[PDB]
Enzyme design. Structure first.
Site, PDB file in Angstrom:
ATOM      1  CB  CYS A  75      -0.996   0.041   1.189  1.00 50.90           C
ATOM      2  SG  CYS A  75      -0.374   0.154   2.874  1.00 50.90           S
ATOM      3  CB  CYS A 157      -1.542   3.162   3.229  1.00 54.38           C
ATOM      4  SG  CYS A 157       0.033   2.158   3.129  1.00 54.38           S
TER       5      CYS A 157
END
Ligand SMILES: N=c1c2ncn3c2ncn1[C@@H]1O[C@H](COP(=O)(O)OP(=O)(O)OC[C@H]2O[C@@H]3[C@H](O)[C@H]2O)[C@@H](O)[C@H]1O
EC number: 3.2.2.-
Length: 252
Positions: A75, A157
């Protein structure tokens, strides 16, 4: 033969065999996907658009395909990009520093292809397909890329990077898929920073493009979502790639 139904190019020749062979190849190379059943993937892809009017496709039509192509990607290593495919792909190929949408099974299956069917027959249309502008937005190709792009942005992320083409008259374009889907589907609970790399198409010594009106617009949209914004110029993309391959080079 002198006048087609739709204004866009028809389906890529041998589309079914091409998608099946790409699935086989991707699954031979990537061990996390080494068990996927490629016949099942093709059946799900074909089910999304065969026998359906090519101006009436929905994100729901692609869900069986999305489920089978479920895949996790690191991520904190995602690279978004708009209108600069060649440099984005050459960069990630050196040592897999980051991952683009075409590094996933579904992005790899569809890259560089066109497809559509017709209402109430099961035939693929190899003669023409709808144009997003002239005919309709809700077409097989456009709806696929919107659906996969939303899921890819949702997955990100930490620090997310985006490569932008600084030779275009809208370096950041609100109307691009990056501007209309990616920016709005990053999750603020997860994503700390969006970092843009503005790629120069020009000579050598040129302007600080991180001051461009459209870059200030991007900064304001992202900041108002509670995500930090950063921007870097890449003045000479040829030199950049060399330094990624060979960073001990004095000139880096
Ligand atoms: N890999 C392709 C691709 N290959 C060929 N095409 C692709 N579209 C999107 N993708 C991917 O979807 C993302 C979103 O596309 P978008 O920026 O709207 O393409 P645009 O620059 O608006 O162009 C989309 C057009 O280019 C064709 C599609 O047939 C066609 O619809 C791209 O950044 C790229 O990651």
């Amino acid at each position: 033969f002198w006048r087609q139904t739709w204004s866009g190019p028809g389906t890529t020749k041998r589309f079914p065999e091409t998608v099946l062979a790409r699935c086989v190849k991707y699954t031979e190379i990537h061990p996390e996907m080494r068990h996927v059943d490629c016949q099942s993937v093709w059946d799900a892809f074909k089910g999304a658009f065969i026998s359906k009017h090519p101006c009436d496709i929905t994100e729901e039509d692609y869900q069986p395909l999305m489920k089978l192509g479920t895949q996790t990607v690191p991520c904190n290593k995602i690279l978004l990009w708009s209108r600069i495919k060649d440099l984005a792909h050459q960069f990630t190929q050196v040592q897999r520093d980051m991952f683009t949408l075409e590094d996933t099974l579904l992005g790899y299956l569809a890259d560089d292809l066109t497809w559509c069917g017709e209402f109430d027959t099961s035939k693929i249309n190899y003669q023409s397909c709808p144009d997003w502008r002239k005919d309709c937005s809700n077409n097989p190709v456009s709806v696929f890329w919107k659906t996969v792009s939303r899921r890819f942005a949702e997955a990100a992320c930490d620090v997310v990077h985006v490569m932008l083409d600084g030779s275009r008259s809208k370096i950041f374009d609100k109307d691009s898929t990056f501007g209309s889907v990616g920016v709005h589907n990053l999750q603020p609970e997860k994503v700390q920073t969006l970092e843009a790399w503005v790629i120069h198409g020009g000579r050598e010594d040129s302007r600080d493009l991180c001051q461009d009106p459209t870059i200030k617009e991007l900064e304001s949209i992202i900041s108002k979502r509670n995500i930090q914004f950063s921007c870097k110029n890449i003045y000479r993309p040829d030199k950049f790639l060399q330094c990624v391959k060979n960073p001990e080079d004095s000139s880096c």
